[PDB]
């Protein structure tokens, strides 16, 4: 120290390389949102499991051709039919109903005309089939959508709603997944007060713990609030021990120098980097600690509030994604057009922005937060602008030029 400056590329790769993948556990399928499957999932039945009608109509023998037919009955959703359709008969079907024995096609109701109904008008008796059915027409055969024994979801699948629905479909209600990381957050600094406190001299309200907790929660991971910790070895070492004991990940912000000393000397953690050649984020620190053959990760983020949130999105979120089993945990980076000119720094530079798609324009505009219309000054950040380092060729970027933006919010 001052620790060597690490490049942004090496810092990032080092985070992903060194972060572990959590172990697995069995969950109920309804809790599967955002989880990664740690098993292949197979169907144990056919979908549909019976030949099913695609249409409201009549189940027929295609060989009978067009003509006048006795309706022997009705097949409806949820009931197995007990009658066999013989030559010159048909059975009424609704969409999804099983096809009875002896019928090999369905003619939709619009290709028919009813001849006779019961006196009370509740019951159709005879119908004119107006078309020549193709065999198997308007029937979903057994197993058309899913076959028994088929693998419907592969291990490594990152599950959303449709995958939860596929589990339900196949009746696989308990599944093996990766664990979610438990994330403990503390703040440090003698100047900090709880949000709930009135100001005292020399002090400000701690906002990072709140912003960082919210960031992590927005991604779905459980969190632990470790509060404000006195910026001294004794309280830092204890907070850090309580974090290590309670969580997979510990994030601190502030005091980055007692912090880096406790990690190395008192905790015996390997600090992989302590300064990053980036803007903002220069003092960011990443360390791992192996105890139990369990690897803990520790992020010591800058105290400055803008820096704490940018660094959390660049480093922490991808690490958590890896921990929870996502095979490629890297963030989504899209192309956008700058809304304003911008001088480049020699450091790679990151800034919160709002992404907006205008009428029939293929690229969204990226508007840097804090400088704003009314409605635009009100909007929440959904991107992180990723500005290139200054060069001899590129010293300045202009409104309208094409830039990289990391997606950090719902679009």
């Amino acid at each position: 120290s001052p620790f060597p400056l690490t490049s942004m590329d090496k810092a990032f790769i080092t985070v992903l390389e060194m972060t572990p993948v959590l172990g697995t556990e069995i969950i109920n399928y309804r809790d599967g949102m955002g989880r990664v499957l740690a098993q292949d999932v197979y169907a144990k039945d056919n979908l549909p499991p019976f030949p099913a009608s695609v249409k409201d109509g009549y189940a027929v023998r295609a060989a009978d051709g067009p003509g006048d037919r006795f309706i022997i009955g009705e097949s409806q959703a949820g009931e197995q039919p007990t009658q066999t359709v013989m030559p010159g008969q048909v059975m009424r079907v609704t969409t999804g109903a099983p096809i009875p024995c002896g019928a090999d096609a369905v003619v939709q109701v619009e290709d028919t005309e009813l001849i006779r109904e019961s006196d009370d008008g509740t019951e159709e008796l005879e119908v004119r089939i107006l078309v020549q059915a193709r065999p198997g027409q308007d029937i979903r055969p057994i197993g058309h959508d899913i076959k028994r024994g088929e693998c419907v979801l592969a291990k490594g699948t990152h599950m959303g709603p449709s995958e939860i629905g596929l589990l339900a479909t196949v009746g696989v209600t308990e599944v093996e997944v990766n664990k979610f990381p438990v994330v403990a957050v503390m703040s440090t600094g003698n100047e900090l007060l709880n949000p709930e406190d009135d100001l005292l001299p020399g002090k400000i309200r701690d906002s990072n713990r709140s912003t960082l907790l919210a960031t992590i929660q927005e991604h779905g991971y459980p969190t632990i609030n470790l509060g404000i910790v006195g910026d001294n070895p004794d309280d830092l070492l204890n907070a850090l021990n309580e974090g290590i004991s309670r969580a997979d990940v510990i994030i601190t912000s502030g005091g980055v120098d007692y912090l880096k000393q406790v990690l190395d000397i008192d905790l015996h953690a390997q600090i992989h980097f302590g300064r990053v050649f980036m803007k903002p984020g220069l003092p960011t620190t990443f360390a791992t600690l192996d105890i139990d053959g369990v690897r803990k990760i520790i992020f010591a983020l800058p105290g400055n509030p803008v820096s704490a949130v940018v660094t959390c999105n660049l480093f922490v979120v991808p690490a958590l994604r890896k921990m929870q089993g996502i095979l490629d945990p890297r963030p989504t980076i899209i192309k956008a057009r700058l809304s304003c000119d911008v001088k480049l720094d020699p450091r790679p530079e990151y800034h919160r922005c709002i992404l907006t798609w205008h009428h029939q324009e293929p690229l969204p505009w990226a508007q840097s937060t804090g400088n704003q219309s009314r409605l635009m000054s009100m909007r929440s950040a959904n991107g992180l602008l990723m500005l290139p380092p200054k060069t001899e060729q590129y010293v300045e970027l202009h409104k309208g030029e094409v830039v990289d933006v990391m997606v950090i919010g719902r679009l």
Partner: peptide, 10 residues
């Protein structure tokens, strides 16, 4: 994919 912003070749 690069964590460090690039400029646009086109």
């Amino acid at each position: 994919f690069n964590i460090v912003g690039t400029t646009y070749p086109c």
